[PDB]
Design a protein around this ligand. Sequence first.
Ligand SMILES: [Zn+2]
Lengths: 88, 252, 171
Amino acid sequence: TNYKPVANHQYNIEYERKKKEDGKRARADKQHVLDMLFSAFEKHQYYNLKDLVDITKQPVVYLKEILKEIGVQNVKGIHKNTWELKPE
Amino acid sequence: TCPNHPDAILVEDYRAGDMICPECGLVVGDRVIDVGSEWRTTMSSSDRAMMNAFKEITTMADRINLPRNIVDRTNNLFKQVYEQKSLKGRANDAIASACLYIACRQEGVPRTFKEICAVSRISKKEIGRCFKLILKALETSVDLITTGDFMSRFCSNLCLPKQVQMAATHIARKAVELDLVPGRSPISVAAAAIYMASQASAEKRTQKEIGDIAGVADVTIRQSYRLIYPRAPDLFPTDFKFDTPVDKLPQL
Amino acid sequence: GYKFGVLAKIVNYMKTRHQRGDTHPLTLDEILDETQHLDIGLKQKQWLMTEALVNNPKIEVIDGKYAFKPKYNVRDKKALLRLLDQHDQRGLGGILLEDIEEALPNSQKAVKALGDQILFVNRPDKKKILFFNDKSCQFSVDEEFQKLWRSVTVDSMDEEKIEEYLKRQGI
DNA sequence: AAGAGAGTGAGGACGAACGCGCCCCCACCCCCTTTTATAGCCCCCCTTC
DNA sequence: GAAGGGGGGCTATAAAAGGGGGTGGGGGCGCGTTCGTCCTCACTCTCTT
Ligand SMILES: [Zn+2]
């Protein structure tokens, strides 16, 4: 009864169904994305790119372009170089 | 190369490991033949990726108790496909699982795509996608599976006697020969044939039981069984002992 | 949110306004209406008036109002040549090609028009640095001579040996 | 003819170097969607008893 | 509640579009050990006294 034939594993279809339902992240307008980024900047001084993506919920490439337009990354000697939301 | 005999086939000698003129006796080469060896008497990404893929292949094989020869054949297929690099985009696990499927087919002991999927994290859909790509890349082919290619594994996994397996093999082959199930998958026919033979013997297996081992939904078994049920007396082997008479086989 | 999510839209909205070609200055209150920030805090109005709208290098105070600073940004071919000349004359340094493209729309026409007058230095990240082409003293030789110049290794010799050759040949 | 300081042998704590990772960013590909005929397989839901 | 049937979905097949997301291959630097340099001290001579 072990390794019985199966078209797809239950864990795989459930994950696939969840991704399909959630769908891919869309490209929001720059103004709305900028407003969300600046609003969240008050909560903390610095954000990680991966963590910032979850908050903004925008494509990584699109988010990076917006962040590059204003934001910059500072080299930190404690963990690694991370993005700083302050343009200056 | 006897100086007296240009173009002479020197005879290898194992006494000292030298080649002697076939008709002079002159020893050309003192002890150059190396008799003992001849006659039986910091890892690269490509290498590391192959290493992990080989580990996955062996891990998959042990799950379904495959012999090492199939694993070796699978490893050779992966090297060809991996080095050819037509499937670089595809995940190595999918390539390995498809290679394992091909290796089983090439050795005459096919495992159904569901059987290979059950031992791999890759879905059956993706294995089929990589299966077709591998054949194109390697310019190879696999002989079409038959109903009898699964009778031994299925019947053995169902704890069915040898006579039931023999009858099941005969029924499935005869049904295909009579074209009673045109277009049906061989696995579906094999499961239905097993069900008919099983129901006609002391060891009776339900539709659900055969589906689980065969990987075929009981509905699919029901459809194929319904097609062959009318010709039940003809499909059964002539020298078969019916615990349950053919006329009293389940109807559904 | 508060004190940070309101000032940005003022700058962003102002940048878009200039692209329409409206060089006319705008008041603090006037910009707030179009930025949907009419409810901005009272102490933010003075903070923007006193610090944000004067310290920023893109805000020009005109007749008491505020207007964009296209003069500082390069928007003409002649300005591009002049800016590089000042950098070389004052030794300020080069400018990345990206900083000019944003400031100068269709910068390719100006960059190609000046031709060799601009020295392009490609960074490892493909970023190009522009430097003024000082045409005062120029000198070049064939690649054969340059390759031969490299073939004459000099870092592999000590001071004593290097100076010895002078008296060896009689110079 | 006798004091502090020192040579020598000798033991003990600390900084730069060496690894030795764990995390990250940039190509590359795949996937998403839409249409259509085809047939088998399979799953969810409804219905009969 | 068990079982059969109806309706609906998945799959391959081509082809194009544009772009998000996953993944593999390199690059980057922080933190647990290791050895030589630095520093401290017990037992005898020496310049100054
Ligand atoms: Zn001879």
